[PDB]
Amino acid sequence: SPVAGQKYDYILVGGGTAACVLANRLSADGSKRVLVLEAGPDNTSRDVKIPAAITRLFRSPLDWNLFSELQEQLAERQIYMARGRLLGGSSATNATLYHRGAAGDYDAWGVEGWSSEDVLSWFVQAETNADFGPGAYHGSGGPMRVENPRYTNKQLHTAFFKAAEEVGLTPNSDFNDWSHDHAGYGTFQVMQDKGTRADMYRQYLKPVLGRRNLQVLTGAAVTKVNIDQAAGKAQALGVEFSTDGPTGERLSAELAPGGEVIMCAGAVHTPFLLKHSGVGPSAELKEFGIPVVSNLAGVGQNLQDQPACLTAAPVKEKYDGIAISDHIYNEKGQIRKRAIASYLLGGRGGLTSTGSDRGAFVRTAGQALPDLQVRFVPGMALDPDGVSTYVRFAKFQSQGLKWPSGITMQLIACRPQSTGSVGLKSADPFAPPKLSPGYLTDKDGADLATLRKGIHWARDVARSSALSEYLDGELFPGSGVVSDDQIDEYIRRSIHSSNAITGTCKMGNAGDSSSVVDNQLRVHGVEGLRVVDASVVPKIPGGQTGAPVVMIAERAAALLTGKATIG
Ligand SMILES: Cc1cc2nc3c(=O)[nH]c(=O)nc-3n(C[C@H](O)[C@H](O)[C@H](O)COP(=O)(O)OP(=O)(O)OC[C@H]3O[C@@H](n4cnc5c(N)ncnc54)[C@H](O)[C@@H]3O)c2cc1C
Numbered sequence: 001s002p003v004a005g006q007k008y009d010y011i012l013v014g015g016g017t018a019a020c021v022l023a024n025r026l027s028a029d030g031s032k033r034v035l036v037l038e039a040g041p042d043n044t045s046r047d048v049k050i051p052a053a054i055t056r057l058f059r060s061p062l063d064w065n066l067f068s069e070l071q072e073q074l075a076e077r078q079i080y081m082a083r084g085r086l087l088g089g090s091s092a093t094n095a096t097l098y099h100r101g102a103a104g105d106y107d108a109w110g111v112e113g114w115s116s117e118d119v120l121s122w123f124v125q126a127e128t129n130a131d132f133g134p135g136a137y138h139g140s141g142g143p144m145r146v147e148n149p150r151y152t153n154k155q156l157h158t159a160f161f162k163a164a165e166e167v168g169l170t171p172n173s174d175f176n177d178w179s180h181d182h183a184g185y186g187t188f189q190v191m192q193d194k195g196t197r198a199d200m201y202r203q204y205l206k207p208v209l210g211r212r213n214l215q216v217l218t219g220a221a222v223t224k225v226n227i228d229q230a231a232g233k234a235q236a237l238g239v240e241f242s243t244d245g246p247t248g249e250r251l252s253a254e255l256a257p258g259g260e261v262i263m264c265a266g267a268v269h270t271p272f273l274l275k276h277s278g279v280g281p282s283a284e285l286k287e288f289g290i291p292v293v294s295n296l297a298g299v300g301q302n303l304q305d306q307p308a309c310l311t312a313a314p315v316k317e318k319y320d321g322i323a324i325s326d327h328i329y330n331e332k333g334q335i336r337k338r339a340i341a342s343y344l345l346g347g348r349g350g351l352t353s354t355g356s357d358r359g360a361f362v363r364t365a366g367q368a369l370p371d372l373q374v375r376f377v378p379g380m381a382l383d384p385d386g387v388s389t390y391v392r393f394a395k396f397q398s399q400g401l402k403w404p405s406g407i408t409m410q411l412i413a414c415r416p417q418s419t420g421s422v423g424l425k426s427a428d429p430f431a432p433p434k435l436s437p438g439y440l441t442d443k444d445g446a447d448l449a450t451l452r453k454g455i456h457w458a459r460d461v462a463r464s465s466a467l468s469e470y471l472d473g474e475l476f477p478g479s480g481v482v483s484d485d486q487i488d489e490y491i492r493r494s495i496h497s498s499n500a501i502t503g504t505c506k507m508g509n510a511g512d513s514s515s516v517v518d519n520q521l522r523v524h525g526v527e528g529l530r531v532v533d534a535s536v537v538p539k540i541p542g543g544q545t546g547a548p549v550v551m552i553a554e555r556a557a558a559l560l561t562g563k564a565t566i567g
Pocket residue numbers: 013014015016017018019037038039040082083084085086087088089090091093094095096097098099220221222223264265266267269273498499500501532533534535544545546547549
């Protein structure tokens with residue numbers, strides 16, 4: 001009905017991080033008719049605008065509320081995997097940390113035309129930075145906003161940095177500068193604009209909603225890509241979707257001649273929807289009676305996510321009130337007047353923080369690149385699951401209680417060796433995906449070793465002069481968790497997502513039969529179908545995965561508009 005009688009040059013399946021970038025670049029010249037279909041609503045919540053309100057976005061109506069299959073290797077638990085459900089997708093719900101990883105991460109892909117030297121200019125193109133001017137590693141003038149965080153904890157941030165230095169870590173003045181080594185401690189830059197969230201809805205899509213050639217539908221849940229098998233195999237015709245959930249009528253948006261469907265549903269829902277479209281491992285599609293259009297073993301394989309555990313310690317009584325928890329809430333859980341005034345008057349203070357924006361990259365055992373990311377938070381976890389503790393922190397408002405003052409160090413396996421999968425547990429495209437993160441399944445136990453050594457490193461840092469001045473014992477993992485076996489059990493029971501998720505429709509070279517797209521991001525064996533999102537990442541870079549997704553979308557837009565070639 002909203003697409004009755006229209007023809008589109010591009011249909012974007014999803015309106016998330018990548019989709020917002022493509023919607024902007026593909027609609028620019030006026031010539032091309034662009035449709036965006038997002039299952040979630042418009043992006044208007046104040047909980048999206050205010051970085052500290054990330055606490056409220058977890059397990060909210062603006063999240064998919066995905067749980068994994070039971071993981072036997074993780075004390076038989078289902079793992080929550082946060083995913084944004086609105087225009088801007090996970091860019092609208094994420095911790096805003098700005099990471100590209102290292103040059104070596106893109107070289108390790110081994111994909112023609114996607115080396116570190118190929119991708120650098122596409123990172124720089126996206127960027128405006130408040131703290132770095134033009135140079136080899138930074139642009140000015142791009143639609144993204146990046147800045148140094150506009151909250152600083154006076155006592156605890158400086159203490160973390162001195163502590164890191166005491167255990168022999170060097171400062172890294174720019175984690176995105178590929179002319180020096182990735183390892184070191186410092187401040188993560190953030191995708192914020194004077195302390196408001198600078199998500200890809202705000203930066204890319206919202207400014208161009210006026211364009212007559214761009215049509216964006218919210219509440220539009222795609223159910224499959226329409227693919228025809230006629231005189232020379234499989235051709236995308238468009239997309240089936242409902243505007244009224246499962247019971248709603250199945251509408252179809254149609255491509256114009258020469259049009260393309262671009263999958264932007266992200267590393268969870270893209271492979272799910274491809275499988276619902278007959279693109280996937282033929283045995284999985286047969287099991288739910290889906291006709292196989294393109295038998296691709298790689299669809300939903302190679303799921304890479306960066307698993308996390310944490311240590312937490314209270315401060316001494318005489319340091320009560322110095323934590324970010326004290327800067328956001330008073331002792332009866334009301335939002336501090338000062339935090340509201342600083343946010344509104346100057347885009348400063350606790351409300352501009354997602355909490356996790358200082359830390360380090362560490363080599364636990366002589367690896368080529370750091371295996372460990374540390375995220376230092378100047379507040380104390382009340383749960384060994386940091387995502388559960390963020391949810392508790394949002395629920396804590398107005399409860400009449402005092403959050404105890406202290407610190408957390410989150411330990412992430414940032415270059416994990418384990419992989420998971422996403423598939424179907426049903427033929428109904430409205431049912432949740434069969435999600436398995438596959439944490440700690442790698443053959444050598446490398447990921448478990450990374451996190452075990454992370455906990456040792458966090459204990460060494462907390463034992464430092466700099467931090468032991470402030471701290472009063474340890475809450476997590478606590479005195480019961482000392483031996484390697486005790487630490488391994490604690491990690492199995494508490495391991496959570498640091499919210500990356502890549503690689504489920506991986507890009508590959510010619511001859512790579514585990515790949516789903518070529519180096520032009522085209523789905524093997526289907527005409528008029530591309531993937532442009534986190535799904536195409538061959539091998540997860542170190543650090544948070546949002547900026548790499550924006551780099552891929554910018555380059556894909558340039559390829560599709562004829563402004564660039566690849567290979
Ligand atoms: C909680 C959290 C914290 C993170 N922290 C950081 C961080 O600090 N820094 C960082 O750089 N990265 C971070 N990440 C990762 C980063 O946000 C993502 O990797 C990135 O946003 C992915 O972009 P994408 O376009 O691949 O997918 P998304 O941005 O997730 O977009 C997918 C879109 O498709 C939509 N969709 C799904 N199914 C359908 C359907 N059937 N029909 C229509 N639409 C559909 C979804 O609703 C969504 O809007 C975080 C992620 C999360 C979730």
